[PDB]
Design a protein around this ligand. Structure first.
Ligand SMILES: Nc1nc2c(ncn2[C@@H]2O[C@@H]3COP(=O)(O)O[C@H]4[C@@H](O)[C@H](n5cc(-c6ccccc6)c6c(N)ncnc65)O[C@@H]4COP(=O)(O)O[C@@H]2[C@@H]3O)c(=O)[nH]1
Lengths: 178, 182
């Protein structure tokens, strides 16, 4: 139940507002190069650094997209912002895409840290998996949504085996095979 | 069941919004009044007023909800690098409350956005929630929020919840009764 409202929160409050307009934001920037899907990272351990360079230094910030505004909930001119990132291979750019973590997992982490929330670390992993499931299902019955974005769910055990940069690039190159 | 959904959303609203803005809020307001509002009976108040309509009916534009609520200006914006999003923007709007053709108050006013999700979830088949579910959920959302705020280090007389059931009714009047109470 907890993760269910979180998943609908994410779609209703954010994904259904911005995705419909994402290509126009790209085409604006691209013409005056970046892939036209939003890449959303879903780390099941819910460990989410505000800076991606923390998760892999081969992930460097490049630019912001043009902002988007909605008047919503009686707040005037609410701003939706996204960041473009380069992904490095042997010190040199290999890819470019719009990239971010799903914020609702950062909420799930903090709830596990605060006593009044009554939420164990075991609860957090199950709610994380649940969150991923629900979001995936919502995004299937909404093709106008799925076709503008790509989800990546994964799990880490300190495993020096794992490069977030390499995994994204694996997904980027595999899109180019279509 | 209807507890855990509501519970979840209340924590989300604290973690991801309230605990980040409530601390700076009074500085933001104070700056606004000193430099841009030398109206002696027309200052902005020091609390954020959060409308909690219990049917989860949330329009996007507060002005169309009631004509005695007029948009005036925005506080200076607050930004944070969040989850890989460089420069996320938290923003708040100042509204004038009109009564008997006069100005009766000025405050920072908004709906609790999470209520929009409770509505949708009771409209979409896939979510599987009734209207009665939504009403139970909205009640528990307010209760959990109150509990959270009563123990929160960021809440320091810098917040007020306004819950109401929702013709003849007037939103501004409702907000004015809370303003006057202080
Ligand atoms: N009043 C107000 N509330 C805010 C604000 N930011 C967050 N919250 C509320 O706090 C709770 C926990 O927030 P998150 O943990 O960040 O989850 C979000 C988030 O990943 C994604 N998203 C929501 C907003 C956005 C913008 C304006 C108003 C409300 C929300 C948003 C954004 N501009 N930029 C990038 N992602 C965003 O959609 C999920 C559901 O969002 P909401 O249901 O609409 O409201 C949230 C939520 O209920 C704000 O500026 N103003």
């Amino acid at each position: 139940n907890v993760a269910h409202g979180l998943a609908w929160s994410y779609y209703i409050g954010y994904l259904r507002l911005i995705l419909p307009e994402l290509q126009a934001r790209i085409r604006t920037y691209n013409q005056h190069a970046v892939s036209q899907r939003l890449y959303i990272l879903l780390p099941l351990d819910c460990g989410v650094p505000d800076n991606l360079s923390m998760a892999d230094p081969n992930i460097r910030f490049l630019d912001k997209l043009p902002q988007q505004t909605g008047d919503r909930a009686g707040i005037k001119d609410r701003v939706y912002s996204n960041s473009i990132y380069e992904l490095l291979e042997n010190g040199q750019r290999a890819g470019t895409c719009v990239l971010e973590y799903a914020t609702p997992l950062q909420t799930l982490f903090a709830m596990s840290q605060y006593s009044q929330a009554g939420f164990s670390r075991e609860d957090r992993l199950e709610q994380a998996k649940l969150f991923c499931r629900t979001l995936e299902d919502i995004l299937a019955d909404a093709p106008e949504s799925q076709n503008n974005c790509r989800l990546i769910a994964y799990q880490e055990p300190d495993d020096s085996s794992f490069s977030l940069s390499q995994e994204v690039l694996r997904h980027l190159r595999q899109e180019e095979k279509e």
